[PDB]
Write a sequence for this structure.
């Protein structure tokens, strides 16, 4: 499994940027996607995919230990829709 | 909707890197995630989320052209699992 440092070293190798500049850009990528989604804005990235949000419906159930009802409210959640290039690469 | 150029301008603003260097890093980010995923490896990015692949199981389906029952092969698809920080930002 790759971590952020593994991704950073490969970003540096692919671009010619230093590992420290690559790290700044990689962190900023995640931060920018986070901010657009926090503002309720979709982020479409040609050749990769689309980051967006979706409404996860309310759920109701029971605590198996107490028998008490648990109501989980409807919530906005992040979502990613892979583009063609990314789907083709993994299939 | 934000596109890749909108994201690159914000990566430049956040890091102090030129838009040209931000563009190189943003494109390399997507390429590195794609390669890891093409190798069947997961990429965990702390404070953002995890890119991975998942197997969609072989099943019985219907041929839309003939109307007849068919056997649909298992397929590997990309997937993204948002971390806590990203979920908290959008809720």
């Amino acid at each position: 499994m790759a971590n952020k440092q593994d991704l950073i070293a490969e970003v540096a190798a692919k671009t010619g940027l230093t590992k420290k500049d690559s790290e700044k850009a990689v962190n900023a990528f995640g931060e920018v996607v986070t901010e657009f989604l926090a503002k309720g804005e979709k982020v479409q990235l040609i050749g990769f995919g689309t980051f967006e949000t979706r409404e996860r419906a309310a759920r109701e159930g029971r605590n198996p230990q107490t028998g008490e009802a648990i109501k989980i409210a409807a919530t906005v959640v992040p979502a990613f829709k892979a583009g063609k290039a990314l789907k083709d690469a993994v299939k």
